[PDB]
Nucleic acid binder design. Structure first.
Ligand SMILES: [Mg+2]
Ligand SMILES: [Mg+2]
Ligand SMILES: [Mg+2]
Ligand SMILES: [Mg+2]
Ligand SMILES: [Mg+2]
Ligand SMILES: [Mg+2]
Ligand SMILES: [Mg+2]
Ligand SMILES: [Mg+2]
Ligand SMILES: [Mg+2]
Ligand SMILES: [Mg+2]
Ligand SMILES: [Mg+2]
Ligand SMILES: [Mg+2]
Ligand SMILES: [Mg+2]
Lengths: 99, 258, 138, 164, 167
RNA sequence: CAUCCGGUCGAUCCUGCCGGAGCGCGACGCUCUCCCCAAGGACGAAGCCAUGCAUGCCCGCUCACCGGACGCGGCGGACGGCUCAGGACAACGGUUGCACCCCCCGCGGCGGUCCUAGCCGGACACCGCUGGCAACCCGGCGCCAAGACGUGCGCGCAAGGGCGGGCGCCCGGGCGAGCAGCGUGACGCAGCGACGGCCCGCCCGGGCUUCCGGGGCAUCACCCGGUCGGCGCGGUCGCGGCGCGCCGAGGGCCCGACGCCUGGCGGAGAAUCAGGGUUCGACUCCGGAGAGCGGGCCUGCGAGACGGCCCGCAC
RNA sequence: CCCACAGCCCCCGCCGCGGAGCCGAGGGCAAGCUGGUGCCAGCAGCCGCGGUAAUUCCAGCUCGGCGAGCGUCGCGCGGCGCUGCUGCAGUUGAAACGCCCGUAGUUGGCCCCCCGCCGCCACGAGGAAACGGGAGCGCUCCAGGCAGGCCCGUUGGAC
RNA sequence: GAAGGGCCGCGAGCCCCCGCGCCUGGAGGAAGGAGAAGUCGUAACAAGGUAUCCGUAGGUGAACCUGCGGAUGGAUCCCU
């Protein structure tokens, strides 16, 4: 945990939405961005999956918005820890949300 | 991956501001570790052969140096590849030539002839304060120099005056708005101006806004801003007052010179 | 209208072009890989081989030869154009064989011939038909 | 590697996309006759140079008059053209540049200035004299027929002081 | 030899990557020390030449260490009798193998020689009047060649007593 | 630097292909007066190798011979040069971080060491006598040198470990960020020292790491099982399923996973030419990988090195 | 003179070798006279010629193109608006699924005068050169190179 | 502190089995294309001498014929 543990937040701060929360103390965050193709002068919508450690100090469900901070390697695929999370409603048509 | 450090340096890969001819050869001098880094320095041989022209080849420079005919910060140096940096002291008593190494407007090294009144000290930038063994405070400078037991009033980014004979601080100029500075990094190397504003972004760089003497304004990060006095330079500087002309004026000047 | 034109539709355009550009016969023949394997010349300008037999609306019989490529061991026919050059080629003589103007396809009224003979025993056919050089060594 | 690998190099001429075209053949022959040209690579070089000038003029003309790049590049181009003498002194607008032709380029050749000074009986005579080294451009003898003479040296092209 | 380079693993999707270089000397490991409690034979410590000329000492056999009583601020050198609990595995306890986190039994002589005459924690006194005291190992044998630690007290002591009581 | 022409018919207009016309890269044929610049065994054989050469230098140690030999010792040989086999969320390109790291030379500082000091002890080399074997290789005895080896005079000092802050948050040694240092209770005597340097900072370099980009086939649609996470120890310069024990179940996928193929090193760039783009990118500069195939290791700050050693296989 | 030694460029005196080939002549495509052979031999990238004037084969004359270079073979770009984002076609030439529902995906009427966020535009920092563009300099010109002159911006090598 | 030995760790080579990819022999069978001036008939183009074509099913030396339903690209834009 970043508040009660012995790890520090350093580097880049990002935002995303919760994709899965089946793990013990971890989640999967989905990030939306845009890619530009010069030939056709148009964009494409892409997505990536990013894993984070969720401290017991937060209650999170799917579709919530989270802020993650970079830290040292915590595992094979984990380098981020949650620091904030806004709530959302269960009923809400999924919307492509770059952040 | 090379199994060890690098001891060579291709001429085509050398820094642009050294002004080395493409056809001079495949190789170029490799500076050795010392007061200044590779990209913030220039070798002695280049000054002594490609500028002052007192030597025509590597061998002549070797003999001149090993005979102890050059002094650096009051200390004779015999390495042709010894790195020369910023705000250094160059002395050749045989011909009574004293120079301080500064930056021109175009962004290249130059020699500023000086007098005997101010060649006993140099200006250095402080960028690190830390506790050493036993907890005794220290500090470091842009020329790889350490001083023990500094005054608490001195903080980071400041500027320090130290005698060449003795590394004892005489006076320190603070880092504050309204002070003349000299840029030493990037697109604006060599420009002289006064500070106007300071804006900090947490966790990242700090940007400085300065205004030239003629009203021109420009920006840069705090890692390449050097203080040279309080409202007036403490040292003698080149003929021009740190004014970068436009392309039109430079072309006119070239035409006049031709 | 017919084609996609939205501002976020470059992926579909790229995929459509990738799929549809395989319909061209030339692009297929050049980028598919079948021809390169099936071509006895394997993309070479010309080949060195060994002749093994001489044979020959227009009703004129054209003179050619059967050859086996040294590096390939498959059989083909190459046609000797210049007059009087049949006698200049002898059975079991090393030759260098190139192609006609139309890559792959037959050229002219000749059925089942797609190559040319340009050297025998190391002498250019043109240099010999004009009497510049001579084949006294063979 | 050897230092010889860093020596730059490029071609200097172009060939017409349609070779067999009667009017072009006749015009090229006529220009050779009035200028005594050896082969047709010289006309190609001239067209190359003219194309470069025209392209630069176009690019500068698309831009605004008060564009700093426009001022700089146009001033340099005008200075070069005037010093060469290809463009008249009284013209100082980039628009006039587009109306230049290869003939103006030919008129500043060494043979041209030699002949219009009446120093030679003809273009062929001028060329043969140039080969034998009887001419002192400025103060220096030159044996290149295609050497171009600037305005400041046109009054100074003389006979070699060493020639018989 | 032994290594911890990640080229030989799988991707997050469980796919094989493929090897593009031979083994490198930065990514190497070494056989575990397996420090044994003594209970020719004696305190045996070896040394290892590590990267950059550094020296790392690992212990193979030892029997004494420094231990502390934080509440009473008492610290002496004692003998470790045996290991009695280890979360990782029971095999280590049977073999008496020393590692960080192992709960050991020390002798009471150096402590009882000055205790039992001052008001303090009751349980520590009960251990003192006996022949052994529960303690823990805080150092890393195999990296520094020493076995130091501190005496238990509070909820963790209750936890370990409740754990090892039925045995 | 915005170009077209001939061919289906008894004649005509279209669609549509075929062929011509230019540039560059190479190979072949013919021919060739003079000067300048200049590539050159890469093209599914990373196939095989006679012959010769490609890394030495010197400050210390002279009863060697008439000081030059030689050898001990020090520095360097991990740079440079050749190639593109392998490898397709990798490498590589731009952008972050180490509050998870190591670092020779050089520069500047600092320099207090627990319990015969007008200067300690023994060896080996070369070398003399004596010898083995085809060659390569070395043996035995013998006096002698060190800025070599060993011990070591000396003002307490390496590594590690325990205790030492707050009362909703914020408002100096240093930070954006409770990070460094110190005191104190116990362990242990590491390093320097027979002409004094352990130690610290900077520099070059290296290791990993955030974000974005990063070949084709769906006649490959479901894949992974240390694979996904947690706890604990070990090992590592060091973080980490890196390895082990226990627990839970997880992770990726038509925004194309996984599998297969590639006559696949990448980039800066090259060719072509209205504008938009297509194809190539062995090779000059940067980075990566290798030295017949596959593995292992010593020395060293630094190599899993091959003009270093050991093994198996093929020659 | 230069060169580590030699060449070589260039300067100086004496004697003085002047040499063009490769393709083609029906159209595309600029360029025509006799003798042979007779659907044979051969030419021909395509159309085509040759079965007695052969304007196309084999020779002579003549003529045209480029030029110390010319022609042939294979590949890439262009030709090509025959891969079409700019910018193809879909009644009859090749091509609208037999029809409906429908998820991912793509696309979504109008309105609030100033707040926050994403995209967007402009400027700026920072970060390698060579190549490319480009200012100036008469290597005799040039391909090039960063020189060079005297009383040189601090001579210059900007961007 | 040498040789030597034992347990584990790295890991070559050989053997056994399985799978993937690329080539390849084959009696006989069957398709296509080209060549010639072959034999058997006439299915289509005119109402082509039974209007043509589509889907389906069966039969027949061969082209093809017939039945069920559909189209006009027909030989009809026209009749309480
Ligand atoms: Mg002591
Ligand atoms: Mg000693
Ligand atoms: Mg390969
Ligand atoms: Mg390289
Ligand atoms: Mg290697
Ligand atoms: Mg090796
Ligand atoms: Mg070798
Ligand atoms: Mg080597
Ligand atoms: Mg149709
Ligand atoms: Mg009929
Ligand atoms: Mg009928
Ligand atoms: Mg009909
Ligand atoms: Mg039809």
């Amino acid at each position: 945990c970043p508040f009660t543990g012995n790890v520090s937040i350093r580097g880049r701060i990002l935002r995303g939405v919760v994709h899965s929360a089946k793990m013990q103390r971890s989640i999967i965050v989905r990030r939306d961005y845009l890619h530009f193709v010069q030939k056709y002068k148009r964009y494409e919508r892409r997505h990536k999956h990013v894993a984070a450690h969720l401290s017991p100090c937060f209650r999170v469900k799917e579709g919530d918005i989270v802020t993650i901070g970079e830290c040292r390697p915590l595992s094979k695929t984990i380098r981020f820890n949650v620091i904030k999370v806004e709530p959302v409603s269960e009923a809400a048509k999924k919307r492509f949300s770059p952040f | 991956m090379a199994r060890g450090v690098r001891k060579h340096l291709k001429r085509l890969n050398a820094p642009k501001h050294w002004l080395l001819d493409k056809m001079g050869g495949i190789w170029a001098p490799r500076p050795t570790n010392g007061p200044h880094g590779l990209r913030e320095c220039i070798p002695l041989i280049l000054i002594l052969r490609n500028r002052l022209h007192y030597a025509n080849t590597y061998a002549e420079t070797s003999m001149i140096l090993q005979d102890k005919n050059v002094l650096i910060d009051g200390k004779p140096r015999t390495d042709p590849t010894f790195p020369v940096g910023f705000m250094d002291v160059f002395e050749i008593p045989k011909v009574h030539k004293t120079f301080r190494v500064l930056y021109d407007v175009k962004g290249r090294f130059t020699l500023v002839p000086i007098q005997s009144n101010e060649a006993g000290f140099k200006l250095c930038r402080v960028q690190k304060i830390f506790l050493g063994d036993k907890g005794m405070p220290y500090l470091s400078t842009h020329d790889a120099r350490t001083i023990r037991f500094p005054h608490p009033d001195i903080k980071t980014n400041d500027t320090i005056k130290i005698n060449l004979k003795t590394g004892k601080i005489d006076e320190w100029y603070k880092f504050d708005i309204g002070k003349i500075v000299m840029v030493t990094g990037g697109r604006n190397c060599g420009r002289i101006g006064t500070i106007q504003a300071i804006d900090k972004h947490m966790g990242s760089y700090t940007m400085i806004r300065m205004k030239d003497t003629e009203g021109t304004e420009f920006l840069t990060r705090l890692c390449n801003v050097f203080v040279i006095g309080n409202d007036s330079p403490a040292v003698a500087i080149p003929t021009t007052k740190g004014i970068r002309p436009d392309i039109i004026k430079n072309r006119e000047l070239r035409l006049r010179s031709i | 209208m017919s084609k996609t034109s939205g501002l976020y539709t470059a992926r579909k355009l790229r995929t459509v072009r990738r799929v549809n550009r395989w319909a061209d016969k030339k692009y297929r023949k050049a980028h598919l890989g079948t021809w390169l394997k099936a071509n006895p010349l394997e993309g070479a300008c010309m080949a060195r081989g060994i002749v093994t037999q001489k044979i020959g609306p227009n009703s004129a019989v054209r003179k050619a030869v059967r050859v086996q490529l040294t590096k390939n061991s498959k059989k083909i026919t190459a046609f000797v154009p210049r007059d009087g050059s049949i006698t200049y080629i002898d059975n079991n003589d090393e030759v260098l064989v190139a192609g006609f103007g139309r890559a792959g396809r037959a050229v002219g009224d000749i059925p089942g011939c797609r190559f040319k003979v340009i050297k025998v025993a190391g002498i250019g056919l043109l240099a010999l038909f004009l009497r510049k050089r001579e084949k006294r060594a063979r | 590697p050897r230092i010889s690998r860093h020596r730059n190099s490029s071609k200097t001429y172009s060939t017409p996309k349609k070779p067999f075209t009667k009017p072009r053949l006749d015009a090229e022959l006529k220009l050779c006759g009035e200028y005594g040209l050896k082969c047709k690579r010289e006309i190609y070089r001239a067209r190359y140079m003219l194309a470069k000038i025209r392209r630069t003029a176009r690019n500068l003309l698309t831009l605004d008059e008060n564009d700093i790049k426009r001022r700089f590049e146009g001033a340099a181009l005008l200075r070069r053209l005037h010093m060469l003498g290809i463009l008249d002194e009284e013209k100082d607008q980039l628009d006039y540049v587009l109306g230049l032709r290869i003939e103006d380029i030919f008129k500043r050749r060494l043979q041209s200035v030699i002949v219009e000074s009446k120093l030679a009986k003809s273009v062929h005579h001028a060329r043969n004299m140039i080969k034998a080294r009887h001419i002192s451009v400025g103060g220096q003898i030159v044996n290149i027929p295609s050497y171009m003479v600037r305005i400041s040296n046109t009054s100074r092209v003389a006979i070699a002081d060493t020639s018989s | 030899g032994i290594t911890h380079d990640k080229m030989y693993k799988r991707s997050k999707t469980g796919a094989v990557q493929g090897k593009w270089h031979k083994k490198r000397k930065y990514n190497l490991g070494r056989q575990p020390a397996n420090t044994k409690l003594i209970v020719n034979e004696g305190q045996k410590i070896s040394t290892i030449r590590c990267r950059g000329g550094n020296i790392k000492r690992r212990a193979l056999r030892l029997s004494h260490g420094s231990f502390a009583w934080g509440s009473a601020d008492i610290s002496h050198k004692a003998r470790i009798l045996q290991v009695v609990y280890n979360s990782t595995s029971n095999e280590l306890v049977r073999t008496n193998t020393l590692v960080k986190g192992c709960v050991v039994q020390i002798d009471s002589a150096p402590f009882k020689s000055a205790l039992s005459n001052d008001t303090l924690d009751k349980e520590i006194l009960d251990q003192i009047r006996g022949d052994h005291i529960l303690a823990r190992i805080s150092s890393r044998p195999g990296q520094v060649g020493t076995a130091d630690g501190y005496i238990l007290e509070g909820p963790e002591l209750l936890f370990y007593q409740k754990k090892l009581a039925p045995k």
